Design a protein around this ligand. Structure first.
Ligand SMILES: OC[C@H]1O[C@@](CO)(O[C@H]2O[C@H](CO)[C@@H](O)[C@H](O)[C@H]2O)[C@@H](O)[C@@H]1O
Ligand SMILES: OC[C@H]1O[C@@](CO)(O[C@H]2O[C@H](CO)[C@@H](O)[C@H](O)[C@H]2O)[C@@H](O)[C@@H]1O
Lengths: 504, 504
């Protein structure tokens, strides 16, 4: 995977509404800033039950957004990452509809999971209670198979029916997705919710050996087609560390909340410790299209004796801090407060999570870019966006607070903001200084500060992060300084916003 | 149960917000109109997860509303109906809280239902799939009993834990409710969601023989205490007809939708047929504190070959007509559109469902009052209220569209409306003419009109209902005329709004 900053975006929420438009925005407003792009599900349809993650036809681009040719055109200037929704599909798919009509007579009957498919001999309370869940309630919903009420397995919305990834039909379906991406100039594949992909009676059905098998098999298929695979997994940090050595890339989901913690408390020890044990074959982010994950650094939910990267007490303080910095906005969109598939992810833009503090935000992005791994910036964060309360009120979908619709006009207006200009420059810097393609090293000043250093062929850079320099949402004091040497001398920025770094 | 019109209301949504104020409004604004009242759950707390139906302490009046002293005061002028929430209780009750902390070591452990309590030897998909549900999804949620994850049985919100009505602790509790009501001057008891109260592996757990046993037993406990029981049951019409012969009262839930059908299509035949087979030991209503039930007249949800009171297509047109008449308001509050416990009840005030046609509304109330049974008028309907989109947007609880908060000021304002004056006068008429305590009979003019007649000791009255006379939400033509004889001779009204009936 190219070691350049990537943009995560919905094709229709950045620009006029199409892939062509999004492409234009990237090439004319972010040239040299984002050399890669993760286009969120743009298949048929993109506006269903779960914003693209409930595809009726995964291999067909929603004609309202564009075509596969638009993707090919885009590939000429940007490396493309696309999702491979391996765990489920829309109940409105031809396959599932055939099952509703014909039931066991349908050739697609084996393709979908039901309670009996996993528990042919029935189940005890323990069997079902032991299934891992991102929120309270069992993963089943009612559907009629040829007039017979069946309990279909659904990990997320009731409209997203889980497929048997180990069935012939399920596997054929997944491979057709891989073939389509490989023939459409896609460079990377994101395996959505792969941790849920395998079910086995008596297990948690989440990140078990049977899951590792599925992941391993999908990677093989990926290598066969020259595609790199990034797997998405929100879980106890230990599972992320362990699975990392078996795949090309994993997300670094611990950094986002660890940085909010550091920026709000001044404590960097947790960041230093994570730096020392984290998987370095990762894709870094601060914000994503979902809410901010916190169980990603907390104790194991299935066994509280297994502690996280910080005490559970610090996680609760972290969460309450976001609620305070957003004046209740995040509280109104998080968990049971609105429609959500996950109970603990905190719904709020990262910028709002920090109380819209520019120095803290630019600093967080700086640390993100300095830790090993390919960095990604969510489009709302790319424009330092605030919580979209109007959209939340309209849809009641918790995560929409962080899924604002950016018109071309809004983009140009926001591009004038000092903090957005600073991020554009920081991203450009991270793409042009060859030090980031060299050796990494760091030193820590006893829970007070941490310095990240990269040494490359013709340059080197050192970022010093010291949160205690500017605590408070109203803080205007920089909490990050940068020193670097390039082909044109020895430089230094004591304020990434007033003095954005630029490569000679 | 006295054969006088009753009002259904929240103690806090009619007046200043207290039981005392609610009492004052009844006595000073509705004297002779509403002689009895069903006060919706006013226990601790009244503003929890399900507006009073998730009690932490069923035997304690919420201190913010008043005390049992206020209920005694009211009883001096009005016969009071109260709810006996026999199916579940708040997860915050001391009893459940004790179980979470101590698990099996809690003396209340046997009091609550879990999957294993009903399925001790496990369950097949068929077992779980056959459990009747008012909305998709299994009736179970996660709770930790002394650290152990358990699947607790919950028919409604996850905060409402179902009790074992067959356990000693469960029955002891229910009897504490009955004892409190009998010792607090309550006259009637409404058995809430009693159709769900009995669970048995292999059965639907809804209105089954085991349910009949529970009802029969609860009725005995009422009889022993001098309390009359009304059971709330929303089901395939035949089930209401059958259970009626075993209890004092049942609601007439078929009439509300049958009248909307009649007023919209002009077909009265369905009403004539219902009049012929309906349980006459009923409590009549148009609107309730819940949504408008339509499965109450449609085909059986389990077996569709068991037809309803009108063809299915007609039930569909009825639902669509309400959505059209409210110009999408009811659609935004119904089913999956907002938080709801029942997928098919249509959320709209009865007035709004009728396109606010005053003549249609007053005629509907007239038919309600003329069919055998004790009439109840929901408070929103008592003031001919429209859908409250403000409240709906604020809470996102679908049924809130029909749960407006009426201050004393707004009440008096509404009392000046001609249709509201007409309803008060009609209710007073229904309470003063002794014809309603005599013999009932009706004649029908083949699907076009139907006349209801009552003959008493010193009076007689005949209501002729003919929707065809003035169809449309925009019509001003009366669709009901009244003729009666009292101590002053013969009288007549061809317009219940312009010329309300007054007993000599
Ligand atoms: O809040 C979303 C919820 O789902 C997870 C599972 O990994 O995220 C991915 O899968 C969902 C179902 O396809 C999508 O809605 C979501 O957009 C996607 O990233 C976690 O983020 C969380 O548990
Ligand atoms: O829409 C509510 C849903 O519940 C029923 C069950 O009879 O109504 C009663 O019980 C609920 C849970 O206590 C209450 O929320 C509701 O207010 C009460 O009348 C049906 O009307 C429907 O299926």
């Amino acid at each position: 995977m190219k070691n350049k900053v990537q943009l995560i975006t919905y094709a229709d929420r950045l620009g006029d509404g199409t892939i062509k438009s999004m492409t234009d925005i990237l090439r004319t407003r972010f040239d040299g800033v984002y050399d890669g792009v993760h286009i969120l599900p743009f298949f048929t349809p993109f506006d269903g039950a779960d914003a693209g993650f409930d595809p009726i036809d995964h291999t067909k681009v929603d004609e309202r957004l564009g075509s596969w040719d638009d993707v090919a055109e885009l590939s000429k200037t940007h490396n493309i990452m696309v999702d491979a929704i391996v765990n489920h599909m829309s109940w409105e798919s031809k396959q599932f509809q055939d099952v509703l009509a014909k039931g066991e007579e349908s050739e697609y009957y084996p393709m979908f999971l039901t309670m009996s498919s996993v528990f042919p001999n029935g189940a005890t309370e323990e069997d079902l209670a032991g299934i891992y869940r991102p929120r309270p309630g069992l993963p089943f919903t009612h559907y009629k198979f040829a007039g017979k009420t069946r309990l279909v397995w659904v990990s997320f919305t009731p409209q997203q029916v889980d497929i048997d990834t180990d069935s012939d039909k399920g596997w054929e379906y997944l491979m057709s997705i891989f073939d389509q991406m490989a023939a459409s100039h896609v460079s990377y594949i994101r395996l959505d919710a792969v941790g849920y992909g395998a079910k086995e009676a008596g297990t948690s059905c989440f990140m078990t050996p049977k899951t590792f098998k599925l992941i391993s098999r999908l990677r093989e298929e990926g290598v066969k087609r020259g595609l790199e695979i990034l797997i998405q997994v929100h879980s106890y940090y230990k599972k992320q560390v362990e699975i990392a050595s078996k795949v090309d890339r994993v997300y670094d989901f611990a950094l986002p909340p660890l940085l909010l913690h550091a920026l709000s408390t001044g404590h960097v020890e947790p960041v230093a410790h994570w730096t020392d044990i984290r998987p370095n074959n990762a894709v870094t982010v601060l914000d994503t299209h979902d809410g901010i994950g916190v169980i990603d650094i907390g104790s194991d939910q299935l066994d509280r004796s297994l502690k996280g990267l910080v005490p559970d007490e610090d996680v609760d303080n972290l969460v309450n801090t976001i609620h305070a910095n957003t004046h209740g906005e995040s509280q109104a969109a998080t968990g049971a407060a609105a429609s959500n598939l996950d109970l603990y992810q905190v719904n709020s833009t990262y910028y709002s999570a920090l109380g819209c503090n520019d120095q803290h935000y630019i600093a967080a992005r700086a640390v993100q870019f300095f830790l090993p791994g390919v960095p990604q910036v969510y489009y709302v964060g790319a424009l330092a966006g605030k919580n979209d309360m109007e959209l939340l009120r309209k849809t009641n979908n918790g995560r929409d607070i962080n899924r604002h619709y950016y018109s071309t006009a809004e983009i140009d207006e926001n591009l004038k903001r000092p903090v957005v200009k600073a991020l554009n420059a920081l991203a450009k810097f991270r793409n042009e200084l060859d030090a980031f393609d060299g050796t990494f090293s760091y030193t820590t000043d006893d829970d007070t500060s941490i310095s990240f250093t990269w040494r490359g062929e013709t340059s080197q850079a050192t970022l010093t992060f010291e949160p205690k320099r500017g605590l408070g949402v109203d803080n205007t004091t920089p909490v990050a300084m940068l020193e670097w040497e390039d082909s044109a001398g020895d430089h230094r920025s004591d304020d990434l916003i007033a003095n954005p770094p630029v490569v000679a």
